[PDB]
Every structure is written in structure tokens, then in C-alpha cells.
Design a protein around this ligand. Sequence first.
Ligand SMILES: Nc1ncnc2c1ncn2[C@@H]1O[C@H](COP(=O)(O)OP(=O)(O)O)[C@@H](O)[C@H]1O
Ligand SMILES: Nc1ncnc2c1ncn2[C@@H]1O[C@H](COP(=O)(O)OP(=O)(O)O)[C@@H](O)[C@H]1O
Ligand SMILES: Nc1ncnc2c1ncn2[C@@H]1O[C@H](COP(=O)(O)OP(=O)(O)O)[C@@H](O)[C@H]1O
Lengths: 505, 500, 478
Amino acid sequence: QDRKSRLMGLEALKSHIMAAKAVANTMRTSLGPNGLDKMMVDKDGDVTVTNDGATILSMMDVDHQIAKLMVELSKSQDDEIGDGTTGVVVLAGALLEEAEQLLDRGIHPIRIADGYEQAARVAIEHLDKISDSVLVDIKDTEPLIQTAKTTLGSKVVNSCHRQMAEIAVNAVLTVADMERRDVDFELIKVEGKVGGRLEDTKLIKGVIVDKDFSHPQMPKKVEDAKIAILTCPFEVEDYKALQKYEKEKFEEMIQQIKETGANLAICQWGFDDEANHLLLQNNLPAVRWVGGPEIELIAIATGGRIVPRFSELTAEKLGFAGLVQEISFGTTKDKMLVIEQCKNSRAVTIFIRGGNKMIIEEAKRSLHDALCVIRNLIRDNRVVYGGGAAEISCALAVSQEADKCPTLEQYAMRAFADALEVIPMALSENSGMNPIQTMTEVRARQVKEMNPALGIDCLHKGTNDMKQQHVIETLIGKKQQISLATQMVRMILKIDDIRKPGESE
Amino acid sequence: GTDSSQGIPQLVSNISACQVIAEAVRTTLGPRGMDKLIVDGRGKATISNDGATILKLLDVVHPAAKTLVDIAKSQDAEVGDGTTSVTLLAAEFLKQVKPYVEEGLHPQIIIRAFRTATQLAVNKIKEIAVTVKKADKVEQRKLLEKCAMTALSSKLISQQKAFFAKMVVDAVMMLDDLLQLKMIGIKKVQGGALEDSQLVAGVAFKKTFSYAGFEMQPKKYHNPKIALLNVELELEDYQAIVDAEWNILYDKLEKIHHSGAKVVLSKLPIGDVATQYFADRDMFCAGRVPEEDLKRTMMACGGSIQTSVNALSADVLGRCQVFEETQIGGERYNFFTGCPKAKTCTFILRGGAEQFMEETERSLHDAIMIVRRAIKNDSVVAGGGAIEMELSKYLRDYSRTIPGKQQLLIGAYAKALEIIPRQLCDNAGFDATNILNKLRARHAQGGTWYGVDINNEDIADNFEAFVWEPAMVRINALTAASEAACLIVSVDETIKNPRS
Amino acid sequence: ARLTSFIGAIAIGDLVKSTLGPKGMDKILLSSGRDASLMVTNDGATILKNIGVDNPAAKVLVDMSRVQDDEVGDGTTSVTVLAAELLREAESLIAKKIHPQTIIAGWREATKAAREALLSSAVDHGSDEVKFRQDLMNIAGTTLSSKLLTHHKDHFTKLAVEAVLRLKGSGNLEAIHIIKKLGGSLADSYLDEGFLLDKKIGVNQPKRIENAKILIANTGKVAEIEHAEKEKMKEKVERILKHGINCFINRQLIYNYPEQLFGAAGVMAIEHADFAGVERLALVTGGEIASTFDHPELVKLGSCKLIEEVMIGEDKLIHFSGVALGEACTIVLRGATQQILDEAERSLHDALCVLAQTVKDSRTVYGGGCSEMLMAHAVTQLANRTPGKEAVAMESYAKALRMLPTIIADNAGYDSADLVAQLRAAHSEGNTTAGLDMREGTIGDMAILGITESFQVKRQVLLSAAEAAEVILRVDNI
Ligand SMILES: Nc1ncnc2c1ncn2[C@@H]1O[C@H](COP(=O)(O)OP(=O)(O)O)[C@@H](O)[C@H]1O
Ligand SMILES: Nc1ncnc2c1ncn2[C@@H]1O[C@H](COP(=O)(O)OP(=O)(O)O)[C@@H](O)[C@H]1O
Ligand SMILES: Nc1ncnc2c1ncn2[C@@H]1O[C@H](COP(=O)(O)OP(=O)(O)O)[C@@H](O)[C@H]1O
């Protein structure tokens, strides 16, 4: 009955470090290709299972303000690249949990933060030094197959992993621009369809709309290029008069459309099925009750633009179609709408027909991060061998640098070395082997041999060298990860008090 | 409560309350002090370094806390530089005089001693302040920028800081009309590097879905003026409503040539899905604009304001110099530069790393504040807690001369003046007592312009370190702190009148 | 959150544990006392469908069980109890600080060995080779265990054997319908070819029709507008008068005034028939399903050959004999209680399904737990061979496989610590031809007993149980 709400600076740092080690060391087990995935359950009605650290931290709700800060900026980093979020979170947690002892030694947090920044600069220059990157990865269709083994090696999708690798290389080729090297929101390679199997996610460069048909007797296969999109709304003998007025309004779609040239002009709202059959005899199909945001999707099949208004419809800006093909989109369900006849889609999207939901999310996230690594590969063909080998090399380098260093920067970089060493222990522990023995052995081997690719083999393969295992990570991704982790530890060390209006002493 | 009664107990309680309020801003002193997180209820946590911002958003309820906060806010409003110093100094005065209160020292004696000590200190400052304004600051500005980069010395921006300093002071000199922080605003853009950061004499705002509709505007247009529209732009009686909607849509195009406005502004959402519909209009548009951009346009270019659907005015396309729309980091940004009253300078915060907003807003803002304050005044004194040490030494030497009650009180005042350098070297993280002892020795015997160095954590001659602070602002800060302490001391009762 | 999820899955498995085998205990389907008088069922599959589940891992396990149920055959109880045993063993191994990844790897490389051992001992039945019926007899009997319809089981097996040549093209299962009423005995099963809907005009309508083209209806001073709508409806019924159809699905409600006109037009108004019969007519006879009838005039109509309405046995026993295809073999029993309906429906559905995969995949293995002991022996042999900590994993897999028929033994009330141990020791020499029999409560050569289970459903059980156990084990938090 004598609670107090005072938060002095050092105990505030202790509390913040406790909160950080709570949000960390929780998703730590998910690090690595065989990390223990986290089953996320919604607080009301949803349950899901996933292994991506960014996803689990994004769904998870955190009460402490420090955790909210870290997770929201991890969201920002995921938006920036989308890889290494797990590494960033676990590394920041490691730094804080091992700098707690430096704080207990009496060091001021500002000194620790500046020493950590110096250590980060040392690590950056060291990792830029030991890069054995390959620069031929532009016309590398065959090497690109083994580039993405690591990001797809966690499941049994290897049966048809080469098919989706070829799909991905075709996708990057059809948008390969040497000037900007970017992909926008409209060019999204995302569409989830339930039902199917692994190989059912095949290469189709077209427009996909899961709406209904114009008429059950209407021939689904059409080739005329006069496709169009319109927002035609549904807007006592007065009822008969209104019906006649609506018919006269739609007469522009029957008669006064020949001079305009809009045959396949689908509708969006309520309609009378009689005029649909009249147009069927007139050979002018029109899909009724289509979705809202599908106007742009169906009008991008040849890289054109969106024309949903009546008077704005022109022959030069008619509907667009992808490429002629005659395959049943629905084996058991009715066929999906064919909008593929004419020309390649600049906003190219590949059909996905996986048979499991979790398969759908894993496939789309693998495609997303494969595109992310490639978009880095074309902007900067620089890669490094990860798997904890780079972290071990950086830790040894910064431990070397602590031998010729001023005082509190010396202790800070000594702390930073042990903090960097966490990634190999996390990987090995997630692999099930001895967390400390294997890391020490690989560290001794990496100081004996000048090879910097001697990491931790979590897949229980032959050797600790990932040059044969094709375990590869880009310079930019690792650089951003380490720099952001250092920025996190610095800024969290800067904070010394949190005050909330509405005190309850 | 706890002994809120006549005389001594209430003064003790008020002193304790002032100590509590100062403890909330104690560690933010210095250019590289700590930082605070404040949550504003609904969950918008606020992070900031400056003390005045922290004080302005506190939840003070205690009368002593309120009557110190108002003094701090008045000091901030009168001069923007130095708010956490006056509160901290006043709280130190109160805490140093508190152990003399319960012994029966009548608070009127403390008031008189504080006033005479403050008068002596203000007199003493005038014999030490040195005029440097004429010494090559307006013309041959090398000294100005040499003082300017001190806010960025010994950091990662050490090599490039000269460029930013020289260029921002170039902007300042041509806009020397009592510049303000609000009307000199900077904007952050994703991507790029730090070396190529540039300053547009205007505004820099990215065009979003609801910001601007039509692209590829006529940039090379020499009379662009803003048109502030206040009506929507984007698209029995069941057909009457359709007819009315179509008539409204047709009437929305009556401003294309009849009104004659190149750029139109609105507070209602703008639809980029109808860009081709706006492409028929073939003119630039603005929507969901921030108030900063609005004010900068009004006092720079002078855009017209429209209320009616067919509001026609002669200021729709008045005289403004140039229109600029250049992609920044792969994204098109709107620049309403080229204005007859273009007293605006928006800085492009180019950079690949996105988290540098706090770094740039703590660095360049302080740098330009130092530049402006050095330009405004003529005479300055050594900073970094150097003038405080000199005042403390002089007051301690003078106190021993006078006989009577005032001697102890002036001595306590001089002791309380030492807290500024102590707090600086404490926030810097180094052993405060050693720095203070070395400073006191070398400052009583050797020289009168030694403060604390934040880089190497040692005493230094801040005069040749080019750490300048105007004499007038320091004098005003000291006077305000002493007067706040006196006002607290002179009060010994509170009256509540709770309900009836 | 590993311990709580593991205990939840273990409890879910234990709840169905007692129902394994053709001796399982009965369960009470209780709820709030509003409508919770008494419901009892021996089968554990229907128990899971009516379980209030809270643990999300238990939700995943129940969803997997539902997948097994609506997939081929009935093995859901076996799959669930096997998963429960596997997670119990996993909890035991975690108690001795064994990392889940090593356990999962060992479980994978033991599941592959068990599956290949099951492939090794598969034996092809003669019903698809030399036309034996006793193998069909046994395969029908084993899946129909814990039931009572053994009197007219001959009719069931007749529909089973007659399916392979007529009722399926590649294993079709939608051509068979089951319907029954209240009041009867075990001697009520008979062959039908349609539903039990009677004419509504009266007694003057002839029983026999000419030809049926069956489709689905569309619909059923405002007085002037109502009269205009009535005139349009009369025009519509006049248009259907010249259609010449004799059967027609009336999805929407029709009152008497157009009902007599439908009868006089030769169009029978089938008042909102169950869509199951409509689907059966669709694939057997050729009556498509549409939304409106005005557009179909002469080419978009149905297709049928002969339909008659008769009354047999005091009930509306209409026999839709003479449709285009003779695959619409409908069984019409006469039950006594409400549970007879669903019980017979699910029993016949599961038996017909397992018969479909037997005629699709003719290889099979002996049931009664001998195959389980065979896979357990194979994985135990594998475990003794490879080093590493996964040895504990495969031996725990073997322990779960051994415990799977121990539950069957216990549910019969017999002993369990001797005849299971006796079976295990014999299985090294008294090989796969051996087995366990609940008729006598002893170990005998299972082949002479003849009770065998189709290989496909057994492999599906093993794969699903291993996959679900691995998925639940892989979860560690939340
Ligand atoms: N085959 C492998 N061998 C060794 N280490 C691997 C392998 N695959 C992934 N890793 C490690 O797993 C870590 C996480 O990789 P990734 O999944 O790309 O990032 P995130 O987990 O943040 O999504 C990386 O640091 C990488 O070193
Ligand atoms: N580079 C520097 N070296 C030494 N002292 C500094 C330096 N920069 C600022 N200071 C000290 O910081 C004090 C002002 O800081 P602060 O009060 O936090 O900001 P503000 O005055 O805007 O509230 C001054 O007394 C000055 O002596
Ligand atoms: N008469 C019998 N003799 C031997 N074993 C039987 C007999 N009936 C059932 N079994 C065994 O019971 C197991 C299935 O039991 P249960 O779960 O009740 O049926 P279902 O798998 O259809 O749910 C099978 O593995 C089978 O070997």
C-alpha cells in the first residue's frame, strides 16, 4: 500500500534493457533456416503459423514503449528491404543484454553508445574489406537458381523450386531496367488463390479477376481487342417508365457504341439479364457486377492506363489484354476471367494456385525477398558469405581493434565483439547442436585459416565453408542490418527517463 | 499534504517541488545530453532533446511548479535560446538556500541578498564581455563559419560541415530580416547522400495521392499563383440527383479558363485515379496541404483564396517568379519557389539512411541558431560554463567583504552558480568533480575564460574554442532565474477555495 | 507456450482414445441443459466435430482430423490418437533436454522407413485381378465395424462390387444416394434410383411421363403493376407449356393458382427439392442447373429418359427407374431413431469411399495392428543402426506405434501388457501374416481371419499423423 512511481535514470535503463531482452530472446529462436517458427493467434478469431521474424514482431502486441519503438522501426526496415529483421532484433537485444554489465560496472551510457558507434564503423570497414563478391550476376540465369536455395531451403518446396526460380528470373528480366532498378506497387507480383498444389503456381503473365461470367451460354474464349471498362450504374406505371428509361440509357451500349468501339465493356452494378442476352446475340460480351479496385488491374494488361468514365473512353484507351491462351483456369470451380489476349503486361504478375494457405504466404514472401535480393544485385552486385562467418570475422576484428583503443571505447568494443558473437550461437542453438562449443570451434578454425566463409553449418552438411553450400548475403543488407542495430543501441542508451501525463501516485 | 502551513514548512515544500520539477529536465543540458520519451495518452510517444519542449508539455499541478514553468516559458518566448538553464539555476538557488531557511533566516533577507547578488553579477558581466561583431563577420565571414561549425565538430559530419555552414549562412545573410525558425523550415526526403544536400528558396513537399493530381506540370512558368478552393473537385427524384451530380461535375470545369489559375489548392481529397480526367484540365493542383506550406506560400507567393464555385479574382495568377517541380530521390516534389516575397529556404535532407532526422534536426537547427544569435548581438562571453565560474569566483570573493547576514547568502549564491558546468560535464559522462576542481583552480589563478570541453573531457580555453554566447541573453537568463527564485521564496501561503 | 499446447493436444487425443477399435466406449454429447437431454455415439470422428476447442494447437489438430474425415475413408480416431502418442513422447524427450529440430529430423527419417516398410508388405487383392468377392467381403466388413447392419450387408457389398464396372469411370462417388424413413428393421435395404417426392396435383395425374427435361424456376395503383406481373407470369407458363417437359425443379415457392396450371401443362412442380437429388439427376440423367428459365427455349433444356411416381410400403416410395445412366444406385432403408439416419449415412459413405480407393489402388495390408507392429519393427531396426541423438526420436516413434494397437486391446476389455508384448516378440518371426483378433482375444495369423485394411488409407493415416505431430512440435511460443 506504499507504491511509488519514481523512475531514476539508471533503474530506467535497467527497465528498458529488461523490456528489450523480453522482446528479444523471444523471437531469437526463429533465427536461422531451421528456427522454431512462431504460431501467431489473433486476440479475437484468427490463428496462423509463420517463421518470418518481421511478421511475428509485426503481429505481436507490445506494451512497453521501448518495444513499440523497436518494432515500429523494424517495420520501417522491413519496408526498406524486408530481410535481416531477425538479425537486427537479436543483435540489438544481444548488445543491450551484454551492455547491462557495462552499466553495472558504472560506465555512463553515452560512452557506451559512442564506443558502439566506433565498433560499428570498424565492423563496416572490415566487412567491406573481406567481401569476395561476384560481379557477373547480371546474365546469370543458371547461378540465379542456386542463389535462392537458402531462402527456399527451409521447406519441401524443393520439388518444384526450380520452376519458381525460372519464374522469378523471367519476372526480373521482363522488368530489368538498368537506369532505376526498382519495382513499384502497381508491378506487384502478388495474388493468392486457394486450392491447387505446388506446381500449380506456374508462369502466367496476365490479368486475373475472379468475378462471374456474362452469361452461362456466352463463349468464354474471345479474341476481339475492343475490350473496355465502364462504371455503368443502376442510377403505378412510373416503375415501367423508369425501366424504359434505364433501357434507353443502356441503348448507348447496344446501338451507340459501334461508332465508339467498345465491345467487351464490362459493368459494375445491377443489370437486367435480358439486354445481356441481346448483346450476346449482338456479339458484345459484358461482365456484370465486377469489383471496385479491379478497374486499373484489367486496364494494365498492356501497360496502358485507367479509363472508367463514359466520355473518356476512346479507341486508343480501350481495354487491354495480355496474351492468347486456352487453358481451364478452374478445374473444379468455374473458369477465371480471360483478360489475356494482346500484349505483355508492364505490371506483370504471375499466376499462383497453391493448395495450402501457409504455402501461399511462404511462396509470396519468398518471391518478395528474392526480388529484394535481386534488386540489390543489379544496383550493387556485392555479396558476402554469412552463416555467422562474417559475424565471427567482425568480432575478431573489433577485438583486435580494442588492443589500440582509448578507455571506454575499449570496453565498449570488447562488449561489441561478444555481442556480435551471438548470431553464431543463435544459429547453432536453433540447429540443435551445442550453442557454445560449435561457435568456439569455428572461431578457432577461422582464426587459424584466413578463410572468412567458415561459418556454422546448421543444415548438418559436410564442411563449414558455405562457398560450396551457396549461403550468400549481400553487402548492402548486412551493412544496413549492423548499422541499424548500432543506431538502436545508441538511441536506447540515450533515453534515460519516460514520463507519462496522468500520473497515479 | 505534509506541513503546508505558515512560514518555514511551506517554503520547504515549495523548494522541494521546484527540485522535483527541475529533476525532469536536469539531464538534457548540453548539446549532447540525454533524451526523454513522453506519451501523450492515446499512444503518440513524444521524443525530444530540448528542455523547453519538455517543460511545455508537462502536467504541472503544484503552484510552485506552475509559477516556475510560466517563468521558463516566458524566458523561452522572449529569447528562444536558454530555458533549461534558468529553471535549473533557480532550483539550485532554492536548494542551496534551503539549509539556511529552517535556522530562522527570514526570507526577506534572502530576497534582498539575492537581488544585490544579481545586480553585482550583471554589473560584473559588462566588464568581461567582448565585442567581436565587427571583427570580420558580415564581410570576410570566415570567423562566422569558424564559430558555426562548432555544433558539428568532432563528429561524422566533420569533413562536410563547412559546406553546410557556409551555405546556410549565405542563405541567412540574404534573408536578414529577423529570421524565424517557423518560416525557415527543412524537409526530409527518402534516399540520396549527405554531401549533395541542397536548399531551395521556397518549399519542398512530395505529391501524394491526395496532394497533387496532375503530373508533368509547366515548370518553366513565370507567373504561378495558388488558388485556394474550398469545394470538392473529384467526382421519385432518383434521376434528379444524377442530373444534379452531372451538372456539378460539368461546373467543376468552369474554373479551367474563366478563373484562370495555374495552381489550385483545396482542403478536400484529390483523386489521382482520375489523373487523366485532371490531364484534360492540364494544370497543377494542390490538396490536403499542410499549414506550414500554406503559410509559406501566402507570405512568399501570395495565393488567392476562393469560396464560391465560380469565384473569379485578379490574384489567381499574380506575379511569382518561377515554378519548380524536380524529382528528389526518385520521387517528384513540389517546389513553390520564385516569389516576390520569397523569404523562405527549405533544405533538402537528402540521405539513404532514414533515421537521421533527429541527427539533422538537432545539429543544423542548433548551428543556425548559434549563427543567428552571434549575428544579432555584438558582445559575447566564453561559454561551456565558463562565465558561471567567473561569476562564482567574483561573488565568493565579494561575499567575504560584507559583514552580516548577506555574506552567507551571497556565498550560497556563488556556490549555486557552479551547477551549469557541473551538469554539462555530468551529461557528457565524465567525472564531474575532477573537472570542477581543475576548473576552479585554473580559473581562480590562471584565467577567466575556461569552461568544459565536451570532446576530450578536459578544461579548455573556450574563448579560443569559439564558444560564444551573447552577454545580453546570459544576463537576462540570470536575472530571470534569480527573480523566479525570489518569487518562490517570498511566498509562504496558499489558499484553496475547493468547492463553495 | 510449448507445454500448454502439448498438454492440450494430449488431452484432445485422450478424449477420443477410448473409442478406438470395434469395442470403443460411448460418449455423451452434453451442453447447456436447453437441448442437452441425451446424445450418444460410439464413433470418435463425430465427437471431434462437436468439441469445444480452445487451444489453437488443438484447433490445428482438430482441423487435420476433419481433413482426414472428409478425405478418403475413416481413420480420424487412429490419426488423432497416434498424434497424441507422438506428442506425449516428444514431451518426454524434451524433458530430457533434446532439441525439437533433432527430434523432427529423426521423426522424418523414421516416417520414411515406416512408409517404405508399409509399401513392402502390400498385397494386391483379387477383386481387381481374378474377381474374388471374399476380399471385398472383408474390406466392407472391417470399415463397417461397431455397427449393426450386418443382415442386409449383402446388398451393401452388391452395390460395392457393381460399382467398379458401371457406377464409376475413375472412382466416381457422387452417383450413389442414401435415404430412409422411420420405422423398420434390418431387412429394409433395397435398390432405388431416385428420391421420394410425390405428385401434388392430386390423383388424376398419370404415374408415367414421356420425357423429362428438368431445370430450376426463377420466381414465384400498384394493383395494375401486380396484374401486369401476373400477365407476364401467365405468358411464362404458356411458354413452358410448349416446352414439352415433364419434370422440373421448383426451387422457389409456388401456390395453387399456378400449380394447377403447371399440372395441366404437364410440368411437375417439384417444390424445392434437396439439392443432393438435383446434383444426382445432373450427373446421372443430364439435368443442368441454371438461374432462370426464360432464356432456355429449345437447346438449353435438360436430358432424361423415363421417370415414374409410385407408392410402395405405405410411404411415398417413388422409384426414378429408367434414367439415362444405371449408376444412380440408391439405398432406401427404414430406420427407427434419428441417429440411424446419420449413422447409416456416414457408414455407407466411408465404406463406399474405401471401396473406391481399393478399386483405384488394389494393394492392401492386413489390419488388426499387425501392420502397425511391422512399421514399429522397421523403425526400431533403423534406430539401432544410426548414431546420434535421433535414436531416441525413432525409438519414441516406435513406442507410439506400439501403443497404437494397445489402445485397441484395452478398449476390448482384454489385457494389454501381454498380448501386445507377445505380438511384438512374435512379429520378428510370426511376421506380417500374424495379427490381433478381438473375436477371441488372442494372437492369430491375421490372413486366415481375413480382416484387412486398404493400403491407401493406412498410408494416409501415417503421413497425416507424422505431419501434424511435426507441425505442432515445431511451435514453441504463442
Ligand atoms: N543454409 C544456411 N546455412 C547457414 N546459415 C543460414 C542458412 N540459411 C540461412 N542462414 C542464416 O539465417 C539468418 C536469417 O536469414 P533470413 O531468413 O534471410 O533473414 P530473416 O531471418 O531476418 O528473414 C541469416 O543471418 C543467415 O546467415
Ligand atoms: N560545443 C559546446 N561546448 C561547450 N559547451 C556548450 C557547447 N554547446 C553548448 N554548450 C553549452 O550548452 C548550454 C546551452 O544548452 P541548452 O540549455 O541545453 O540549450 P538551450 O540553451 O537552447 O536551452 C550553454 O550554456 C553552453 O555553454
Ligand atoms: N474386427 C476387427 N478385427 C481386427 N481389427 C479391427 C477390427 N475392426 C477394427 N479393427 C481395427 O481398428 C482400427 C480402426 O478403428 P476405428 O478408429 O474404430 O475405425 P476408424 O479407423 O474407421 O475410425 C483399424 O486399424 C483396424 O485394424
